[PDB]
UniProtKB/Swiss-Prot annotation, chains A, B:
Cysteine disulfide partners in this protein: none
Role of this protein: Allosteric enzyme that catalyzes the rate-limiting step in glycogen catabolism, the phosphorolytic cleavage of glycogen to produce glucose-1-phosphate, and plays a central role in maintaining cellular and organismal glucose homeostasis.
CDD domains registered for this protein in UniProt: GT35_Glycogen_Phosphorylase
Protein name: Glycogen phosphorylase, muscle form
Entry EC no(s): 2.4.1.1
Requisite cofactors: pyridoxal 5'-phosphate
Stretches that traverse the bilayer: none
Lineage: Eukaryota, Metazoa, Chordata, Craniata, Vertebrata
Catalytic activity: [(1->4)-alpha-D-glucosyl](n) + phosphate = [(1->4)-alpha-D-glucosyl](n-1) + alpha-D-glucose 1-phosphate
Amino acid sequence: KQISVRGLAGVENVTELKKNFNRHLHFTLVKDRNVATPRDYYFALAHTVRDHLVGRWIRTQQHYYEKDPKRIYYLSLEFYMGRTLQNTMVNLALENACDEATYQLGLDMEELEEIEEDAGLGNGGLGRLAACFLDSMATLGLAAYGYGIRYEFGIFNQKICGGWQMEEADDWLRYGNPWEKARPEFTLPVHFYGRVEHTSQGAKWVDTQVVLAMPYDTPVPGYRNNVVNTMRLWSAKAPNDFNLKDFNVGGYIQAVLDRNLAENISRVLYPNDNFFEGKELRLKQEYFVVAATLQDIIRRFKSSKFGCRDPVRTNFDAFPDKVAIQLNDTHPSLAIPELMRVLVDLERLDWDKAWEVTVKTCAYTNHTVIPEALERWPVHLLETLLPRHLQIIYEINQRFLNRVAAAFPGDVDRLRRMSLVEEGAVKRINMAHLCIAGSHAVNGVARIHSEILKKTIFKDFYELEPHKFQNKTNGITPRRWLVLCNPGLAEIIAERIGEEYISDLDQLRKLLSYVDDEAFIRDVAKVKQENKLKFAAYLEREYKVHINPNSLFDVQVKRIHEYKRQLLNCLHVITLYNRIKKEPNKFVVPRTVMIGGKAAPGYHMAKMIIKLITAIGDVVNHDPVVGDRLRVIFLENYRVSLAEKVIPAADLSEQISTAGTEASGTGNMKFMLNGALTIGTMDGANVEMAEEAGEENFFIFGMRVEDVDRLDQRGYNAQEYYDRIPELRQIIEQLSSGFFSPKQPDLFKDIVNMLMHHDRFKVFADYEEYVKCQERVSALYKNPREWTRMVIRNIATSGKFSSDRTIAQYAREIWGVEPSRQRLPAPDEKIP
Amino acid sequence: KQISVRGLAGVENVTELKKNFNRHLHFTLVKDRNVATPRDYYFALAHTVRDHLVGRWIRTQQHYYEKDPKRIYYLSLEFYMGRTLQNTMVNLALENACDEATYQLGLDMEELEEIEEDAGLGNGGLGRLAACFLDSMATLGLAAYGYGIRYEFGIFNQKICGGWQMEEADDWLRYGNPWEKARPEFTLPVHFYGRVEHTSQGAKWVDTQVVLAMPYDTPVPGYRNNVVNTMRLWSAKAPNDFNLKDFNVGGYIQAVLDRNLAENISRVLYPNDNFFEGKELRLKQEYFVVAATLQDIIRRFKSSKFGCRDPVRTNFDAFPDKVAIQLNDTHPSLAIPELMRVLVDLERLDWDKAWEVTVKTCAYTNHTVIPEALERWPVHLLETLLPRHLQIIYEINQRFLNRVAAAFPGDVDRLRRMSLVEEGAVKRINMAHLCIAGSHAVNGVARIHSEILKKTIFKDFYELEPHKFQNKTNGITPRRWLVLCNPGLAEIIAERIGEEYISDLDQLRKLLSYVDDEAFIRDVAKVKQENKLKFAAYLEREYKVHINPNSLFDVQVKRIHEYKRQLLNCLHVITLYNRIKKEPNKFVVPRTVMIGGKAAPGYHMAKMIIKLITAIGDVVNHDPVVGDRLRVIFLENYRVSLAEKVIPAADLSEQISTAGTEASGTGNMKFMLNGALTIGTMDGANVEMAEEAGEENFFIFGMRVEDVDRLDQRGYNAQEYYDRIPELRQIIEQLSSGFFSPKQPDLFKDIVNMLMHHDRFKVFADYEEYVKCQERVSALYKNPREWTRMVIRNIATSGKFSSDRTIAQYAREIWGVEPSRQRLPAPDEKIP
Ligand SMILES: Nc1ncnc2c1ncn2[C@@H]1O[C@H](COP(=O)(O)O)[C@@H](O)[C@H]1O
Ligand SMILES: Nc1ncnc2c1ncn2[C@@H]1O[C@H](COP(=O)(O)O)[C@@H](O)[C@H]1O
Ligand SMILES: Nc1ncnc2c1ncn2[C@@H]1O[C@H](COP(=O)(O)O)[C@@H](O)[C@H]1O
Ligand SMILES: Nc1ncnc2c1ncn2[C@@H]1O[C@H](COP(=O)(O)O)[C@@H](O)[C@H]1O
Ligand SMILES: *Cc1c(COP(=O)(O)O)cnc(C)c1O
Ligand SMILES: *Cc1c(COP(=O)(O)O)cnc(C)c1O
């Protein structure tokens, strides 16, 4: 029945909304009632909600121009936004008035929200982080700017055909985007290739090709405080001139068709999660965000109340007190040599003076320690495409290694290990060394990840500069991740403690005084039950299904990777299958195991792991002896809007990374706040979460970081595990015999040789502890009342994992900025 | 001071307009007064004017769906619209209220109209015709549809650098288009390549690639009668599937970058005027309009009150009484085999029965007799790209030549001359033969052009089917071409005869009773003078100039071609130059000779002719002895909105085509209605115009069609002319000596060898008569009063050259449709 505090259904504003809705169907959409579709209705609603945003967005921006804050620019190559409609109504408190208004126009608003396409401009974690951050910078009142690429194809749509992933182009822009404001008026040029001449006073980047960067702005509304900040996303556009001009007389028409070569820089998002691919088109995407963003930054500093102020030079020795740029991973590292290039080559500051300014402005977030994720660009590729930025990266290495030398006299290996230039047969630039060297702050995303950085990959850097290294554990936004996807839970919590918790999540602690309160136990388990019934039917309707809603909904949803160990969960699922087929009239707690997530194309192992899951589902789900008891499902095309549907309905969250690989995790937190219990290793933010709810209100198993290290020193031999555990040996035999692949028996023999001979993530070493820890999960699900009271101990202790906490600490400890909860005055106009 | 009847500046609607204008700056544009530019103001105005259009457009279309007219589809690959803002206000009578409203918002509306980009979706004549037709079908109340390609780059922008044309891409869509309504909702597929299998009952076009055709609609408002018709322009979009799907596993990312190959079909307009280029991309553009349009046509027949009606089959033996398709030139000829393909292959009608339906639906306009303009497609290219349409074109040739054979027994040369298949070493299909064979009507665009067709190129066709051949002389729209570009002239005429003439131009005859009326002579010469002063300053401001406004403004503006004979006008200009330098203190009527127009890139001669003109301007305009007396100017980037500025200010119209080459002409008519006097040959519609004003109120010279034919029989020898005329011989010597090219003396030696040795258009044969006829022009300009009274005899007799006359005859004699002047009721809605 919903009607939670989705705000007020004010009679006035409901008459105002129905009116404006009907106006956009007519004037904007040019459609009449006896020819408009649901999609037409979705669009009229989008444009009406978007109209209540703009006086606040115009006022917020006018406001920062006269009040001149220090501004925070968050540079990221991914912004994984998902849908905007419900969120904007949550934030603007329009949700009950517009469901009334559409109720009375006769429509079902929840039906129309499903017509919205996700903005899938990110891959997984790093980009959802960027998107959660944005909401929390807007809610904390900060003059903050998200800058990225407007990709026309975001992350691909995954189709499973014959158990295999088939990729499809994510054509999210086809029907339009009501939430962007193209600003061609504000287009800027980006230069590529060319050459350098060092003439008279200095270096000059000459005979470059030009690509134009065209801005498109989306409003980011804070939670109910009248602040609407901007995300500025750049599109690539060919110049009107050389494309034809100069002697490129190989066809006028061919010359016009070749504009595309240059518009290809923002055509598509590279589909890889935690993996570097040294592709020239990725380096152009990286350089293109940085060049157009830095011109926008320098232009707002110059012409923001310094526009007035002369008397000596444009003094950039105020630039760090007016500017902060956060580098989200090393994909924007070119911001360092680019700020040096404009400062030294264009503004003709002195190197030392421009460097000090660059360091005090810049800061870097590391997102993984895994080697193959790290960005090490071929220097042949850097000086063709950016010959001046390679000069500048050489000068910087030289001055930095002279700082190392002077502080660690004679330690010639330190010099070679700290170098930004990796001498090897294919000399490369290590971009994370660049970022550490040119940022005043470097941070990890969970305390364990941040300690691993200090003790192993950046230890040379940490003893040279202890002061750069920090931690800022990730967060999730309680607006999307609690009140937007779980209005039932938010209602029952608000009903007991109020609504002040959505901008102050630590308040969830007050729920601890209701673990022993019976009305609350019935309510917490009833929302969980409605959400499970609502997801059961989602799959029978939108994908034909019959899952059983009374089973434990066991879900692992995240990008498909070997470190994430979807395969361990796979090994758990066929044990349980085989225990059942051996003692079939033995009771067992029923479960639906749902596993979903995207594989990069060409990550062959990840593509085999999808095929293994669906192959376990083909057998398990069609065995008459198993019945209700076990159902294996692959959840196709996992994305942000599916995550808002499957994380509310889950009972068990599966976060089983090998310890020391998952830097933080954030699905982690989405499940803890929404009432699931976590099975997991002492990895990433899991460690912090078990610390917040009590180890005992969590299900930890497996090796700790020391134990993987103790096992690598020995040498990991999986033949030992196979040999010592019959249950495991049997799974391996089934796999290699063709039990799961009848017609093609040797299909999964790649995963078996991987597990048996070169498994980097030690699946078999965590298997016994995982099957045992999984017995304890089922034992407690059997006790409903007690499963629900540790769920309440998890929800009530989730406050630390709100992004408002993360961002209030980035603000204070790195940007040097202060958070506000205050409402911007922002009404608007009126005259007659 | 303007304020003509540009309608009423109603206080109410002026308050309504200022209000809505301010609304779009805020809600649509997201801009505030202290940050909006002129372009922002232009856009808010465009969106407010466009809002008064939509209830009429939605009502007009609802109206044709219940009233079910026969619909007229005008298939054209060019629609040369120009700007839409002023036109829509002219047609909707909003022009005085919006100039008041913007006056009071403080803006200058005439300033904001100049921010509008032309829709330059056409090359010259054929496409402006299509655009004039559209306005007149909407003004005559016809259920008519313009269908074309939405090109992203229309015809190039011409820059002259060093006297040479330099092409630039026409990026008209950059800042947006407020007048289109994308309708992705209504996307349809177009198939290419594949193969045919003839299975069981019939042929099947199998294994085709698919390109999606995406519709974009623009409103076409009739003059003040509440009718708003649609122009539907198709965009090419890649499928989401094979682009990646199938084994096109040569990169996921490369697969996404290759979507462009298919979106290239509507990237750019081929820049050639009256010239065929057998390029595969042109044939895909041609097939793409036809396939998506014909699906739209069949779908509105089926599902328009026949949607209700069953009881036997969908009977297409009602299709010609419900449908008319006009083929604008042979660029849509594929409509014939495509209607046969759907009817025979898809609806499984019998061939004879589907053919009769195709002929009675189809009709064809020929636009030129010049050979190199004619479209003769390589059959290797037709059966790769469209293997079924080549089967169908073979069957049709076979049945047609069996009709010829039966009626002209034994005439084996007729058979080979009438064939749609030109056997030659590169077998080709003659598309005009196809069009004659599959249309029930074929028409020329001027009576002489239409007689030339019957007597020479299609004479075999005419004696086989006399009944197909017709004439429909072209027209120009008096809305754009009189009241929109010349409000001064329209005011003074309306002031004496009223305003009913703008939808009934023949009324201009009433002005004949004011040739001997003095108030009218002062008024007709004063508007001409204001318009000349307003164009003088246009070039000094927008291009730095100082032309003299008291000189005779002598202008030839049209596409650069050898048949058009810009070179004869060039030969006139240096005679006059040399007469002056020989008798310098002899008075001569001063003139500014303006020549402008676009050359196709790679039409080398046309590109030399531009260079010759600017080279005559470099010498002539910098001779101290010449002074005020002669100024040669190249009018750069001639397009529709420049034509609205230079045709009002002209005194002399130059239409000097070699007789029998210009099929009709329409610049012709624009100048006659706007008060210029025509110098011209007895070519195209010039013949009809001299017939309407009296031969004597015109300046005819040169060979008539018989004389060119009499000279070709002899053989044309230009050495005879050179030999017999000293003035000519001298021009040739100057040209070949380097008089006009000091630093590179042999630069124009290509044009001299062309003139002297292989001039197809007989420049020198019309030279004596042209210099002599030009003496008579200057003699009358010396007599102001008498130049103005023959101008009044030209304006007063222009009525026949309105497109409402052309279209009322296409309607009656070919579409079988009746014209209405009645106002559609069309107000709109209201409720509380
Ligand atoms: N030159 C100016 N005069 C007055 N207001 C301005 C000016 N420049 C910016 N503003 C205001 O501040 C906003 C900041 O623009 P931007 O620098 O692009 O983020 C503008 O949209 C206006 O509200
Ligand atoms: N995320 C990944 N993890 C591990 N190996 C990968 C991953 N993505 C790709 N690969 C490997 O790296 C190559 C380049 O990446 P891609 O074309 O994206 O698969 C592939 O051909 C595989 O050999
Ligand atoms: N199925 C229908 N029911 C009612 N009105 C319709 C229907 N189909 C079309 N119309 C009306 O007629 C117009 C014609 O659409 P079209 O066939 O696309 O040119 C629509 O925009 C509606 O105004
Ligand atoms: N409109 C034209 N009239 C005459 N010759 C032309 C024209 N356009 C092109 N040509 C010739 O035809 C060839 C193909 O056309 P284009 O590439 O458009 O110039 C050119 O290379 C010239 O040889
Ligand atoms: C939050 C989120 C993630 C991150 O989940 P992890 O378990 O941290 O990998 C990935 N993808 C989607 C769609 C998400 O919403
Ligand atoms: C009307 C028009 C033409 C046609 O002029 P002609 O003299 O018939 O060639 C060509 N181009 C433009 C821009 C026009 O407006």
